[PDB]
């Protein structure tokens, strides 16, 4: 009994945590370093800066009067970037792991596959999706992450009035949006976003009782009528085949 609701609650606890994690990692810096070289990536894996720390120390390593290696330099850049990226991926997987280890409903179904079915490749933020999320305007980022309130606000103020270190998303996504309490239902399970958007309120991120009840009430109406149609026919079939509207009782209805 209640297998479906309970398994569902488990699964959505999982989703909320992966989502909250996505929003933490997305706005954040990751620094790879190799030999004096600091590559700085956003959570989305996008290279923000390529710097040399301690020019005093490291400059003669690459020569410069000496001519630059550009081979050593290339390898160390490559390596630094790889390091940063690997930090990102590990952060994602970490989030996944904390979730699995604390989620008892998902533990109930005994599945080793829960641990492998979503990994660094699979989880968000996705690197090949960086552009559309990062290159986006502050307004666009707001609507992308499902904050309709602040996006509408920003839009009205937009009309009426008409190497840097920081991930482009640390503007729109602040600390408080890591709270899984805040995450709108539209955004929770990205795979299904276009369907789960209709459960949502027209302006507010929170689910609308009215819309959902409307939707249910429609189907209930239809299904009620179907029920009586079928009852009608089954009864008429009974009376037809039996020949009369009467039936025997059971041997036990004598007492």
């Amino acid at each position: 009994s209640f297998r479906y609701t309970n398994n569902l609650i488990g699964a959505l606890k999982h989703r909320l945590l992966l989502e909250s994690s996505y929003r933490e990692i997305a706005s954040r810096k990751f620094i790879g370093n190799c030999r004096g070289v600091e590559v700085v990536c956003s959570g989305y894996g996008t290279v923000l800066a390529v710097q040399l720390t301690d020019k005093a120390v490291w400059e003669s390593f690459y020569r410069k009067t000496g001519s630059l290696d550009l081979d050593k330099l290339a390898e160390s850049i490559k390596t630094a970037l790889w390091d940063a990226t690997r930090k990102i991926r590990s952060a994602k997987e970490a989030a996944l792991h904390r979730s699995l280890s604390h989620n008892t409903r998902m533990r109930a179904s005994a599945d080793l596959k829960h641990w492998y079915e979503e990994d660094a490749n699979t989880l968000r933020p996705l690197a090949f999706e960086a552009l559309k999320h990062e290159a986006a305007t502050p307004w666009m980022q707001l609507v992308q992450h499902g904050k309709k309130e602040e996006a509408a606000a920003l839009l009205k103020e937009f009309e009426q009035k008409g190497n840097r270190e920081q991930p482009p998303l640390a503007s729109t996504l602040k600390a408080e949006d890591s709270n899984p309490a805040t995450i709108p239902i539209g955004s929770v399970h990205p795979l299904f976003t276009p369907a789960l958007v209709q459960i949502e309120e027209a302006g507010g991120g929170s689910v609308s009782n009215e819309a959902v009840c409307r939707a249910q009430l429609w189907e209930l109406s239809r299904d009620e009528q179907l029920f009586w149609e079928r009852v009608e026919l089954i009864r008429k079939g009974q009376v037809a085949s039996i020949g009369s509207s009467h039936k025997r009782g059971y041997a036990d209805e004598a007492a």
Partner: protein
Amino acid sequence: HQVYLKDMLHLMRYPEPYTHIIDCRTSTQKMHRWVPHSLWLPRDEVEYALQLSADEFLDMYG
């Protein structure tokens, strides 16, 4: 195993896709309302009904 009134109201407002509520009321003369999301298999037919194939059952009870 039992299912109590609480479970019943809960399942009225929050149905599960693969939970079926099956109405067993036998006489049509006595049944004036419809338990939400229910279906009608009257008790008298059950022994037969449950021995139909998926298709045949579909044809007999709709």
